[PDB]
Design an enzyme around this catalytic site. Structure first.
Site, PDB file in Angstrom:
ATOM      1  N   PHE A 192       0.122   6.678   1.793  1.00 18.42           N
ATOM      2  CA  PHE A 192      -0.752   7.670   2.406  1.00 18.42           C
ATOM      3  C   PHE A 192      -0.097   9.053   2.357  1.00 18.42           C
ATOM      4  O   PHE A 192       1.131   9.195   2.242  1.00 18.42           O
ATOM      5  CB  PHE A 192      -1.091   7.306   3.872  1.00 18.42           C
ATOM      6  CG  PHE A 192       0.119   7.111   4.770  1.00 18.42           C
ATOM      7  CD1 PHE A 192       0.880   5.930   4.678  1.00 18.42           C
ATOM      8  CD2 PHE A 192       0.451   8.101   5.691  1.00 18.42           C
ATOM      9  CE1 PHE A 192       1.969   5.750   5.515  1.00 18.42           C
ATOM     10  CE2 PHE A 192       1.548   7.912   6.532  1.00 18.42           C
ATOM     11  CZ  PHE A 192       2.304   6.734   6.442  1.00 18.42           C
ATOM     12  N   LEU A 202       5.051   6.932  13.230  1.00 19.93           N
ATOM     13  CA  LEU A 202       5.227   6.044  12.099  1.00 19.93           C
ATOM     14  C   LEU A 202       6.650   6.040  11.665  1.00 19.93           C
ATOM     15  O   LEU A 202       7.006   5.282  10.760  1.00 19.93           O
ATOM     16  CB  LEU A 202       4.288   6.491  10.948  1.00 19.93           C
ATOM     17  CG  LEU A 202       2.835   6.554  11.322  1.00 19.93           C
ATOM     18  CD1 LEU A 202       2.009   7.155  10.209  1.00 19.93           C
ATOM     19  CD2 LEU A 202       2.359   5.147  11.615  1.00 19.93           C
ATOM     20  N   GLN A 243      -5.503   7.681   2.506  1.00 21.65           N
ATOM     21  CA  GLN A 243      -4.829   6.468   2.079  1.00 21.65           C
ATOM     22  C   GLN A 243      -5.427   5.936   0.788  1.00 21.65           C
ATOM     23  O   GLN A 243      -6.649   5.838   0.678  1.00 21.65           O
ATOM     24  CB  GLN A 243      -4.966   5.391   3.153  1.00 21.65           C
ATOM     25  CG  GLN A 243      -4.172   4.077   2.901  1.00 21.65           C
ATOM     26  CD  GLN A 243      -4.399   3.037   3.997  1.00 21.65           C
ATOM     27  OE1 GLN A 243      -4.976   3.367   5.040  1.00 21.65           O
ATOM     28  NE2 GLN A 243      -4.003   1.773   3.804  1.00 21.65           N
ATOM     29  N   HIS A 278       7.396   3.252   8.452  1.00 26.63           N
ATOM     30  CA  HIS A 278       6.869   3.450   7.099  1.00 26.63           C
ATOM     31  C   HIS A 278       7.848   4.346   6.369  1.00 26.63           C
ATOM     32  O   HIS A 278       8.300   5.366   6.920  1.00 26.63           O
ATOM     33  CB  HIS A 278       5.508   4.108   7.165  1.00 26.63           C
ATOM     34  CG  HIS A 278       4.458   3.229   7.815  1.00 26.63           C
ATOM     35  ND1 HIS A 278       3.579   2.455   7.188  1.00 26.63           N
ATOM     36  CD2 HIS A 278       4.265   3.082   9.175  1.00 26.63           C
ATOM     37  CE1 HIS A 278       2.865   1.845   8.101  1.00 26.63           C
ATOM     38  NE2 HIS A 278       3.289   2.229   9.290  1.00 26.63           N
ATOM     39  N   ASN A 298       1.836  -0.418   4.831  1.00 24.20           N
ATOM     40  CA  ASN A 298       2.428  -1.762   4.708  1.00 24.20           C
ATOM     41  C   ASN A 298       1.744  -2.710   5.651  1.00 24.20           C
ATOM     42  O   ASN A 298       0.699  -2.346   6.198  1.00 24.20           O
ATOM     43  CB  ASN A 298       3.960  -1.736   4.986  1.00 24.20           C
ATOM     44  CG  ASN A 298       4.436  -1.156   6.303  1.00 24.20           C
ATOM     45  OD1 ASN A 298       5.349  -0.327   6.375  1.00 24.20           O
ATOM     46  ND2 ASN A 298       3.827  -1.504   7.412  1.00 24.20           N
ATOM     47  N   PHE A 315      -5.258  13.188  10.229  1.00 23.04           N
ATOM     48  CA  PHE A 315      -4.239  12.150  10.184  1.00 23.04           C
ATOM     49  C   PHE A 315      -3.698  11.969   8.758  1.00 23.04           C
ATOM     50  O   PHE A 315      -2.573  12.375   8.483  1.00 23.04           O
ATOM     51  CB  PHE A 315      -4.884  10.861  10.711  1.00 23.04           C
ATOM     52  CG  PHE A 315      -3.972   9.634  10.707  1.00 23.04           C
ATOM     53  CD1 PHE A 315      -2.590   9.781  10.825  1.00 23.04           C
ATOM     54  CD2 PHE A 315      -4.546   8.366  10.547  1.00 23.04           C
ATOM     55  CE1 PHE A 315      -1.772   8.651  10.777  1.00 23.04           C
ATOM     56  CE2 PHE A 315      -3.712   7.245  10.500  1.00 23.04           C
ATOM     57  CZ  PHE A 315      -2.349   7.403  10.611  1.00 23.04           C
ATOM     58  N   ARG A 322      -9.584   5.152   2.532  1.00 26.90           N
ATOM     59  CA  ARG A 322      -9.582   5.391   3.954  1.00 26.90           C
ATOM     60  C   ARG A 322      -9.007   6.777   4.207  1.00 26.90           C
ATOM     61  O   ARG A 322      -7.833   7.047   3.903  1.00 26.90           O
ATOM     62  CB  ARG A 322      -8.730   4.289   4.607  1.00 26.90           C
ATOM     63  CG  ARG A 322      -8.729   4.225   6.113  1.00 26.90           C
ATOM     64  CD  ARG A 322      -7.878   3.045   6.564  1.00 26.90           C
ATOM     65  NE  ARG A 322      -7.688   3.114   8.006  1.00 26.90           N
ATOM     66  CZ  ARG A 322      -6.522   3.456   8.571  1.00 26.90           C
ATOM     67  NH1 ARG A 322      -5.444   3.761   7.854  1.00 26.90           N
ATOM     68  NH2 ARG A 322      -6.415   3.511   9.909  1.00 26.90           N
TER      69      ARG A 322
END
EC number: 5.2.1.8
Lengths: 165, 11
Positions: A113, A122, A63, A126, A102, A60, A55
């Site tokens: 990521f 985030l 991942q 994370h 997660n 951004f 992904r």
């Protein structure tokens, strides 16, 4: 003690693209950094080699880390299936930050990521545990194959990985 | 939206 440096060699549909190396902050998050380090050497008998970035969303992050199911749903830690959020001392301050993916509080496995922008939303959710030390231009080249919905137009794999220092 | 989750990927 010196923080470990780990590397990934990225391939795009089997063609090698380049090497990205990461510094892992074992001095601030020893347990999360150790998990990523052992999964990059494969020393427990499983790990990131041969897995893909499933992904990628341009602007951004990229991942990956699912070496069990490969479709984005699996992966596991060297400590059992999931482990706790060690701390949230570090934030997602800009491009290059390495952090754990997660499914809510204390669900860390192997998925992770690489941020290509500051993602302050985030923070506190994370655990940040490393940064890109060298090869940010390879991460930038990887974004070209992602899309707004995350599906990649080419298979991006970790052709090889291991520890440098 | 812009989240990074394992299992149910949200918008």
């Amino acid at each position: 003690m010196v923080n470990p440096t780990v590397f990934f060699d990225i391939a795009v549909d089997g063609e090698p693209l380049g090497r990205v190396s990461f510094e892992l902050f074992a001095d601030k998050v020893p347990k999360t950094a150790e998990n990523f380090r052992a999964l990059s050497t494969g020393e427990k008998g499983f790990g990131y080699k041969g897995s893909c970035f499933h992904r990628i969303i341009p602007g951004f992050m990229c991942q990956g880390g699912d070496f069990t199911r490969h479709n984005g749903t699996g992966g596991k830690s060297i400590y059992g299936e999931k482990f706790e959020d060690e701390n949230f001392i570090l934030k997602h301050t800009g491009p290059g930050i390495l952090s754990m993916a997660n499914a809510g509080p204390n669900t860390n496995g192997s998925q992770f990521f690489i941020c290509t922008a500051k993602t302050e939303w985030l923070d506190g959710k994370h655990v940040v545990f490393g940064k890109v030390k060298e090869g940010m231009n390879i991460v930038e080249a990887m974004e070209r194959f992602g899309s707004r919905n995350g599906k990649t137009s080419k298979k991006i794999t970790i052709a090889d990985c291991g520890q440098l220092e | 939206x812009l989240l990074v989750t394992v299992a149910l990927v949200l918008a």
